[PDB]
Design a protein around this motif. Sequence first.
Motif, PDB file in Angstrom:
ATOM      1  N   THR A  85       0.819  -1.378  -0.170  1.00  0.00           N
ATOM      2  CA  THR A  85       0.063  -0.140  -0.228  1.00  0.00           C
ATOM      3  C   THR A  85       0.828   1.281   0.061  1.00  0.00           C
ATOM      4  OG1 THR A  85      -1.759  -1.032   1.385  1.00  0.00           O
ATOM      5  CG2 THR A  85      -1.914   1.225   1.262  1.00  0.00           C
ATOM      6  N   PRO A  86       0.748   2.228  -1.155  1.00  0.00           N
ATOM      7  CA  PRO A  86       1.538   3.337  -0.972  1.00  0.00           C
ATOM      8  C   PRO A  86       1.193   4.380  -0.087  1.00  0.00           C
ATOM      9  CG  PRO A  86       0.242   3.538  -2.957  1.00  0.00           C
ATOM     10  CD  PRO A  86      -0.085   2.120  -2.199  1.00  0.00           C
ATOM     11  N   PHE A  87       2.102   5.391   0.244  1.00  0.00           N
ATOM     12  CA  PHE A  87       1.774   6.546   1.091  1.00  0.00           C
ATOM     13  C   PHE A  87       2.690   7.647   0.521  1.00  0.00           C
ATOM     14  CE2 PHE A  87       5.200   7.251   3.906  1.00  0.00           C
ATOM     15  CZ  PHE A  87       5.855   6.246   3.975  1.00  0.00           C
ATOM     16  N   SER A  88       2.409   8.801   0.604  1.00  0.00           N
ATOM     17  CA  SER A  88       3.156   9.924   0.210  1.00  0.00           C
ATOM     18  C   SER A  88       2.804  11.258   0.965  1.00  0.00           C
ATOM     19  CB  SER A  88       2.564  10.044  -1.259  1.00  0.00           C
ATOM     20  OG  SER A  88       1.183  10.542  -1.487  1.00  0.00           O
ATOM     21  N   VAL A  89       3.939  12.079   0.943  1.00  0.00           N
ATOM     22  CA  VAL A  89       3.894  13.314   1.985  1.00  0.00           C
ATOM     23  C   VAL A  89       4.408  14.365   1.309  1.00  0.00           C
ATOM     24  CG1 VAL A  89       4.246  14.290   4.075  1.00  0.00           C
ATOM     25  CG2 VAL A  89       4.033  11.716   3.991  1.00  0.00           C
ATOM     26  N   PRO A  90       3.776  15.113   0.247  1.00  0.00           N
ATOM     27  CA  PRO A  90       4.289  16.239  -0.177  1.00  0.00           C
ATOM     28  C   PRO A  90       4.142  17.544   0.648  1.00  0.00           C
ATOM     29  CG  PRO A  90       1.896  15.833  -0.971  1.00  0.00           C
ATOM     30  CD  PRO A  90       2.393  14.626  -0.343  1.00  0.00           C
ATOM     31  N   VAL A  91       5.092  18.182   0.879  1.00  0.00           N
ATOM     32  CA  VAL A  91       5.208  19.081   1.769  1.00  0.00           C
ATOM     33  C   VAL A  91       5.060  20.555   1.119  1.00  0.00           C
ATOM     34  CG1 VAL A  91       6.621  20.484   3.579  1.00  0.00           C
ATOM     35  CG2 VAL A  91       6.511  18.076   3.259  1.00  0.00           C
ATOM     36  N   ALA A  92       3.892  21.205   1.262  1.00  0.00           N
ATOM     37  CA  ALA A  92       3.909  22.558   0.452  1.00  0.00           C
ATOM     38  C   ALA A  92       4.537  23.858   1.371  1.00  0.00           C
ATOM     39  CB  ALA A  92       2.239  22.748   0.288  1.00  0.00           C
ATOM     40  N   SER A  93       4.341  23.622   2.569  1.00  0.00           N
ATOM     41  CA  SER A  93       5.013  24.583   3.526  1.00  0.00           C
ATOM     42  C   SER A  93       5.694  23.916   4.984  1.00  0.00           C
ATOM     43  CB  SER A  93       4.251  25.659   3.834  1.00  0.00           C
ATOM     44  OG  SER A  93       4.771  26.822   4.546  1.00  0.00           O
ATOM     45  N   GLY A  94       6.907  23.732   4.837  1.00  0.00           N
ATOM     46  CA  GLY A  94       7.636  23.148   6.234  1.00  0.00           C
ATOM     47  C   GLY A  94       8.867  22.434   5.686  1.00  0.00           C
ATOM     48  N   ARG A  95       9.615  22.009   6.869  1.00  0.00           N
ATOM     49  CA  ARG A  95      10.811  21.354   6.828  1.00  0.00           C
ATOM     50  C   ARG A  95      10.802  20.228   7.375  1.00  0.00           C
ATOM     51  NH1 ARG A  95      11.072  24.558   3.225  1.00  0.00           N
ATOM     52  NH2 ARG A  95      12.907  25.862   2.263  1.00  0.00           N
ATOM     53  N   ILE A  96      11.008  18.947   6.752  1.00  0.00           N
ATOM     54  CA  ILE A  96      11.350  17.918   7.459  1.00  0.00           C
ATOM     55  C   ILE A  96      12.645  17.723   7.941  1.00  0.00           C
ATOM     56  CG2 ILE A  96      11.942  15.309   6.963  1.00  0.00           C
ATOM     57  CD1 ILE A  96       9.726  15.507   4.589  1.00  0.00           C
ATOM     58  N   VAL A  97      12.819  17.533   9.508  1.00  0.00           N
ATOM     59  CA  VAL A  97      13.881  17.725  10.245  1.00  0.00           C
ATOM     60  C   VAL A  97      14.376  16.544  10.873  1.00  0.00           C
ATOM     61  CG1 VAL A  97      13.426  20.159  10.704  1.00  0.00           C
ATOM     62  CG2 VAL A  97      12.594  18.616  12.386  1.00  0.00           C
ATOM     63  N   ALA A  98      13.472  15.351  11.075  1.00  0.00           N
ATOM     64  CA  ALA A  98      13.921  13.979  11.739  1.00  0.00           C
ATOM     65  C   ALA A  98      12.736  13.034  11.436  1.00  0.00           C
ATOM     66  CB  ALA A  98      14.113  14.375  13.255  1.00  0.00           C
ATOM     67  N   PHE A  99      13.017  11.808  11.898  1.00  0.00           N
ATOM     68  CA  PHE A  99      12.171  10.550  11.898  1.00  0.00           C
ATOM     69  C   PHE A  99      12.232   9.901  13.054  1.00  0.00           C
ATOM     70  CE2 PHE A  99      14.662  11.222   7.698  1.00  0.00           C
ATOM     71  CZ  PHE A  99      13.574  11.750   7.043  1.00  0.00           C
ATOM     72  N   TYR A 100      11.204   8.967  13.149  1.00  0.00           N
ATOM     73  CA  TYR A 100      11.185   8.020  14.229  1.00  0.00           C
ATOM     74  C   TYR A 100      10.490   6.759  13.722  1.00  0.00           C
ATOM     75  CZ  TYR A 100       6.218   8.606  15.130  1.00  0.00           C
ATOM     76  OH  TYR A 100       4.816   8.606  15.033  1.00  0.00           O
ATOM     77  N   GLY A 101      10.149   5.790  14.435  1.00  0.00           N
ATOM     78  CA  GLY A 101       9.633   4.393  14.034  1.00  0.00           C
ATOM     79  C   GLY A 101       9.864   3.323  14.941  1.00  0.00           C
ATOM     80  N   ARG A 102       9.334   2.093  14.368  1.00  0.00           N
ATOM     81  CA  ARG A 102       9.343   0.787  15.088  1.00  0.00           C
ATOM     82  C   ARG A 102      10.309  -0.044  14.233  1.00  0.00           C
ATOM     83  NH1 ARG A 102       5.591   0.236  19.210  1.00  0.00           N
ATOM     84  NH2 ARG A 102       6.165  -1.772  19.393  1.00  0.00           N
ATOM     85  N   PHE A 103      11.182  -0.790  15.086  1.00  0.00           N
ATOM     86  CA  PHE A 103      12.354  -1.418  14.481  1.00  0.00           C
ATOM     87  C   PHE A 103      12.563  -2.688  15.263  1.00  0.00           C
ATOM     88  CE2 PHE A 103      13.706   2.267  12.129  1.00  0.00           C
ATOM     89  CZ  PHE A 103      13.243   3.262  12.741  1.00  0.00           C
ATOM     90  N   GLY A 104      12.883  -3.678  14.645  1.00  0.00           N
ATOM     91  CA  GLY A 104      13.559  -4.903  14.906  1.00  0.00           C
ATOM     92  C   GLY A 104      14.560  -5.316  14.065  1.00  0.00           C
ATOM     93  N   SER A 105      14.827  -6.295  13.325  1.00  0.00           N
ATOM     94  CA  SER A 105      15.886  -6.441  12.447  1.00  0.00           C
ATOM     95  C   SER A 105      15.517  -5.695  10.902  1.00  0.00           C
ATOM     96  CB  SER A 105      15.854  -8.256  12.027  1.00  0.00           C
ATOM     97  OG  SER A 105      14.722  -8.766  11.688  1.00  0.00           O
ATOM     98  N   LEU A 106      14.099  -5.447  10.987  1.00  0.00           N
ATOM     99  CA  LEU A 106      13.915  -4.480   9.847  1.00  0.00           C
ATOM    100  C   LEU A 106      13.133  -3.461  10.302  1.00  0.00           C
ATOM    101  CD1 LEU A 106      12.245  -7.310   7.617  1.00  0.00           C
ATOM    102  CD2 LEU A 106      14.438  -6.076   7.202  1.00  0.00           C
TER     103      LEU A 106
END
Lengths: 144, 144, 144, 144
Positions: free
Chosen positions: D112-133
Motif C-alpha cells: 500500500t503506497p503512502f506519500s507526503v508532499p510538503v507545501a510549507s514546512g521542513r522535514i527535520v527528523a524521523f522515528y519508527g518501530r524497529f527489529g531486524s527490519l
Amino acid sequence: SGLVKLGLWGGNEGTLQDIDGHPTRLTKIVIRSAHAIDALQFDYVEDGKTFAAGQWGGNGGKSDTIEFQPGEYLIAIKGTTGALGAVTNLVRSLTFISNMRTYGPFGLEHGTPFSVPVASGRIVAFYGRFGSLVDAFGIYLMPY
Amino acid sequence: SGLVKLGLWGGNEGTLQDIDGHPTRLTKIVIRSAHAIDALQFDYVEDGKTFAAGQWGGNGGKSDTIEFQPGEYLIAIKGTTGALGAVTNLVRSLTFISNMRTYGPFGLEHGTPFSVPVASGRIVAFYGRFGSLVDAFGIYLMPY
Amino acid sequence: SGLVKLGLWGGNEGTLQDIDGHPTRLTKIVIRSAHAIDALQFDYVEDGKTFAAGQWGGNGGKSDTIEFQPGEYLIAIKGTTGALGAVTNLVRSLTFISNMRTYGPFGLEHGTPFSVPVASGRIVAFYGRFGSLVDAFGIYLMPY
Amino acid sequence: SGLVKLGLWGGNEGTLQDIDGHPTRLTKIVIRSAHAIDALQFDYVEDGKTFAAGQWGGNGGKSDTIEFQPGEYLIAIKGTTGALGAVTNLVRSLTFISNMRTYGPFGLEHGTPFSVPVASGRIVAFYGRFGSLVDAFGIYLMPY
C-alpha cells in the motif's frame, strides 16, 4: 503561518482555493460526494470567532456533515486520487478519523491511496483545487 | 511544547502550578489583588472544550473579572515584582492590555517592572508559583 | 511565521528594521555600545546556510561579538530603556544570558528595566528601530 | 512538541525508537534496504550541534548514503507498507525527494503506497518501530 501545510494530493485542473485566516480549531466539515468528492466546506475558529471556508466545489452528490464534539479532534485522514471519466486526476475519496470515531469513506476508493496519521499535532484547516469537483486536496497542521 | 513559554518573573516560594496540553484560546481571567496579586484563575479552550485553571493563590484582596469578547485578544502584559512583608520577591502588580482596552493595573506598582509587548502571536494561558499570594508569573504564547 | 514576535521595547524614533527570512538558529550577535546601544547586527541559519542581517544603527561606541558555541543558546535577555540626552526613549542597555554564560551588560543600565526569561523556546532573531542609535528592540522565538 | 509528528506508517511489531528534543535541520540519511527497508540512520542539528540518530534496525541489505548539501532539503517522502516473512505489516520501500533530486526508491514498491508532499514546512527528523527490519516509520516537521 506557524502551520505545516501538506499537499497537494490530486491533479492540476480546477481553480486553487485557500484560506485567508489564522485557524486554531476545526469545528465542522461538510462534504459532498458521489463517485468522487464533489465539494468541501469547513468552519474554523480564530480569536474566539467562527469563520466559514468554502463551499469549494460543485453542488452534485450527496451531503454529509461532520461536527466535532468538545474534546474531539482528527487523528488521521485517508483518501484516494485518480481519474474519473474525462478528468485525468482528482480526489476520489476521503475518510476522516477522530479520537472518537470514523467518518466515511466518502466517494469511491478507486485509484492511488494516501494516508496522514497524526502522532503529535492538530488538523485545523484545508485547501485544494476545485471546479465542479475536488481536483486536489491539502491539509494545515498545528504542533501540539 | 508547541507553545512558547516565558517566565518566571518573581521568586521561588510557593507551588509551581502549570497547565497540561496546548491551549489555543484564553477566554477569561479572574484576578485577586490589594497590596500585591493574591490569586489568578483563567478559563481556556482546548479542542473545543473549555477548561478552568486555578484558582491559584489565596482569597485575600478584591476580585476582578476580565472577560474577552470574540475578536478580542491580549497584545501586552505588564507588571512588577518585589518584596512584601517577609516574602522577598513576589508579584506586586499586573496589567492586561487587549486590542480593545486596558485592564488594570491591579495591585501596587512597587518594585522591578517587567513588560511583554506582543507584535505577532497570541497569549493563550499562564503559569506561576503560588502560596497565599502570587509568588511568580509566566505566559504561554502561540504563533499567529 | 511560526515564530512568536515580542516587541517593541523602547521609543518611536528611528526607522523600523526587520527580517523576512525563516531563521532556525541564532549564531552570532555584533553589538556596538557606549552610554547606550549604538547598533545591532546578527547572523542566523536557514536550510544549513548562514545569513547576515544588519548592521542596524550607527557606527559610534565600541564593538562586541557574541558567537554561540554548539550546544549553547539564549535562555534570557534583559535590558533597560529610557532617555539619553535629547532622546526621550531608546535602548540604554542589553544583557544576553545563555545556558553557559552571561554576555554584557552593554551600555549603561539607566531607565526602565525589561526582562525576557525563556522557560520553553529558542530565540532565533531580532528586530527594532534604528537611527544613529538603537531606538527600540524586539525578539523572535520558536517553540521547543 | 513544537514539531508536527506524522506517523506511524506500517505495523505494530518491533520496538519504538525516537529522538528527544527539537531538531531543526536534517543533514544526512543512511538507509539499508533489499526486499524491504532494513535500517535507518540520520544526522540532525540542534542548537548548532550535530547528533546521530540510529542506526535503528538490522544489518541486512545494502547501504545507501544521502548527504544533503547546504540549501538542500526534502520536499516530499513516499513509500509502501506491507507484509514480509514473519511480519504482517512493515515498511517495504521509501523514496526521499529533495529540492535538488530524488533519492530512491529503496526496497521494493510492493504493498500500500503512502506519500507526503510538503507545501510549507521542513522535514527535520524521523522515528519508527524497529527489529531486524523497519516495522514502522514516521516524520517530524517544522513550520517554515
